[PDB]
Structure formats: C-alpha cells, structure tokens
Amino acid sequence: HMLTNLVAEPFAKLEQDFGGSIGVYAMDTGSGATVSYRAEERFPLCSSFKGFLAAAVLARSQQQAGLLDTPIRYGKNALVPWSPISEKYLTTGMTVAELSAAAVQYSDNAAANLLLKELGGPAGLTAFMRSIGDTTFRLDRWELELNSAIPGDARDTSSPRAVTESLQKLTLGSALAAPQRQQFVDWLKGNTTGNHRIRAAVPADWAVGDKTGTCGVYGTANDYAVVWPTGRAPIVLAVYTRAPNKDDKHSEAVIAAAARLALEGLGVNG
Ligand SMILES: Cc1cc(C)c2c(CP(=O)(O)O)cc(=O)oc2c1
Ligand SMILES: Cc1cc(C)c2c(CP(=O)(O)O)cc(=O)oc2c1
Ligand SMILES: Cc1cc(C)c2c(CP(=O)(O)O)cc(=O)oc2c1
C-alpha cells in the first residue's frame, strides 16, 4: 500500500500528459513489495500475448518430445502484415521453435497465428493461462483482428497485475520446468522490438527480457518484462496504455517513463 501511494501523483501526471490511461504492476520478487496503478483494469494485449503463446508451446514441449523441432509449412495467405521472419522462409517452412522465437523476438504475426493454430486457437492459449492460475487473461481473436482495442471491450485483454503474476510464474516460478523456463527467459532477453520501452529505463549492466504489444489505435500499446538488477532479486513488471479516441497515438516514451516510475517506487536505484 505504501509504495502504491508513493507513486500515485507522478503516475496521474504522466497519464494526463499522455492523454489516456496507464496501467502498471511491478513486483520486487525479493521483498514481495509491489507498485500498482490501474493494475486491475483491463487493457488490450495486442502482441503481448505472443510471449505467453511461446510459454504455452514450451509447456506442451514438456509433454510432447520433439515438438520444438517439428517443421511447419505455410502459404502466402498466412503472411499478414508484420511477418518479418516468416516471410523469408515462406518457400521453406520453419520449425515450431523458430516460429516461437520469431513471435517473441520480432513479434512476427504469421508465426503467432501458426502457433495459435497448433495450440487450439485463442481458447487454447486462454486454457493454458487458466492452468497456471490466471483467471483474468483472455484471448479471443487472431492477428490482426485482436488489435481493435475497442473501449470497454474485454476481448483480447488482461490486467497489468495478472500479466505480471503470470510472467513471474513462467520465468521465475514453477509453471515451467527448469529447461523450458530458461528457454522462455532467453527468448524474452533476445527481444528486438522493445528498446524504447521498459528497456529504456533499465541500466546497461542489468539483464532484461521483455515482450511488446502495439495495437495501433486508441493509444494502445504495452510492454512487460523481467529485470535482473545486479545484487538483488529480479523485478517483474507490466506497463499497459490505452486512450479514449481511436486516432489517439500510443507513446513509447510514456511506457519507458512509467517503467522508470515503477522502478523508482520499488526503490531500485538505476
Ligand atoms: C495461420 C492461421 C491464421 C488464422 C487467422 C486462422 C484463423 C482465423 P481466420 O483465418 O479464419 O480469420 C482460424 C484458424 O482456425 O486458423 C487460422 C490459422
Ligand atoms: C495450449 C495449452 C497448453 C497446456 C500445457 C495446457 C494445459 C496443461 P494440460 O492439463 O492440458 O496438460 C491445460 C489446459 O487446459 O490447456 C493447456 C493449453
Ligand atoms: C502492423 C504492426 C505490427 C506490429 C507487430 C507492430 C509492432 C510490434 P509490437 O509492439 O506489437 O510488438 C510495433 C509497432 O509499432 O507497430 C507494429 C505494427
């Protein structure tokens, strides 16, 4: 409660300058201290579901040996906008692991949709999240229909708190077996799309993995991350934004600034 009260005023100023709503939940996994701002509100997931998608693939790989090596072939009709890796292998195919890495590290849309199909669609990913104790997450649609980000629409949303809680379980807790857990961490650490978001608030000598999302309407974009400061326990945090008007633009700088405030609220110098 004390740290949440500590950052309420700066968060309100930040979201008023942004012109929308900012949702943050940050957890110090050492002390258990947390910072919350709109942490229970629903925000569109956008591409941030793709991280949980790769975790679901890894969970299944614990039950099905060789799943990660399975080649997947696809047609030109799979190549929806922003498929930067999968479009280069259209004439060849890619493995499940390569699709997962592309979905996490390049936010590749075709890769995400192909893996969603393997897992039974949006309801299958939602079922995985329920299995780890997340009752908030819901995926309803595919890329790119899930970007609609309609105000008040619960489809394809979660809350910052639920995102952080599930991310902790999958990267630091026991939701995945140790080898799969480290693979998930390694994919997040290799993400290329988040340099202007949470990472922009993280000192160079701290390890960080993240997954971004950008819906492109209603000022809606996000990032979640696990941060390993040196000499203390890791921090898990989620930063989500939205705004009232369809033509409102998202802001990467606002996401980075919100991450800075969350870390400052936890007393993590850096
Ligand atoms: C690779 C892929 C992509 C999509 C979008 C789907 C869909 C949704 P649609 O294409 O019907 O709009 C359902 C499905 O079952 O498989 C997919 C596989
Ligand atoms: C896509 C996916 C993956 C897994 C591991 C599950 C689990 C674990 P399961 O009990 O099936 O072994 C529960 C579930 O309901 O959905 C999933 C969806
Ligand atoms: C059409 C499109 C698709 C994506 C995946 C993006 C992303 C990557 P994401 O943040 O969703 O992971 C950033 C962006 O600014 O525009 C996009 C536009």
From Swiss-Prot:
Translocase recorded as keyword: no
Enzyme Commission number(s) of this protein: 3.5.2.6
Impact upon substituting P81R: Increases catalytic efficiency about 40-fold with respect to ceftazidime and reduces catalytic efficiency about 10-fold with respect to nitrocefin
Listed GO MF terms: beta-lactamase activity
Keywords attached to this entry: Antibiotic resistance, Hydrolase, Plasmid, Signal
Alphabetical list of InterPro entries matching this protein: Beta-lactam/transpept-like, Beta-lactam_cat, Beta-lactam_class-A
Binding, a beta-lactam: S47, K50, W82, S107, N109, T212, T214
Example of a GO biological process term: beta-lactam antibiotic catabolic process
Pfam entry (one): Beta-lactamase2
Highest taxon of source: Bacteria
Disulfide bonds: none
UniProt activity-regulation remark: Not inhibited by EDTA, inhibited by clavulanic acid and tazobactam. Inhibited by cyclic boronates, including vaborbactam and bicyclic analogs of taniborbactam.
Residues forming the catalytic site: S47, E145
Catalytic function, reaction form: a beta-lactam + H2O = a substituted beta-amino acid
Function: Class A beta-lactamase which confers resistance to the beta-lactam antibiotics, including penicillins, cephalosporins and carbapenems. Acts via hydrolysis of the beta-lactam ring. Has penicillin-, cephalosporin- and carbapenem-hydrolyzing activities.
Family: Belongs to the class-A beta-lactamase family.
Note: Initially two different KPC beta-lactamases were identified from two different Klebsiella (KPC-1 and KPC-2); they were later shown to be identical. The class A beta-lactamase family has a specific amino-acid numbering system, sometimes called Ambler or ABL numbering and often misspelt as Amber. A multiple sequence alignment was used to derive a consensus sequence and then the consensus was numbered taking into account insertions and deletions. This allows use of identical numbers, e.g. for active site residues, despite differences in protein length. UniProt always uses natural numbering of residues, hence there appear to be differences in numbering between this entry and some papers.
NCBIfam families, per database record: bla_class_A, blaKPC, classA_carba
Name under which the protein is recorded: Carbapenem-hydrolyzing beta-lactamase KPC-2
Provenance organism: Klebsiella pneumoniae
Taxonomic lineage of the native organism: Bacteria, Pseudomonadati, Pseudomonadota, Gammaproteobacteria, Enterobacterales
Encoding gene per record: KPC-2
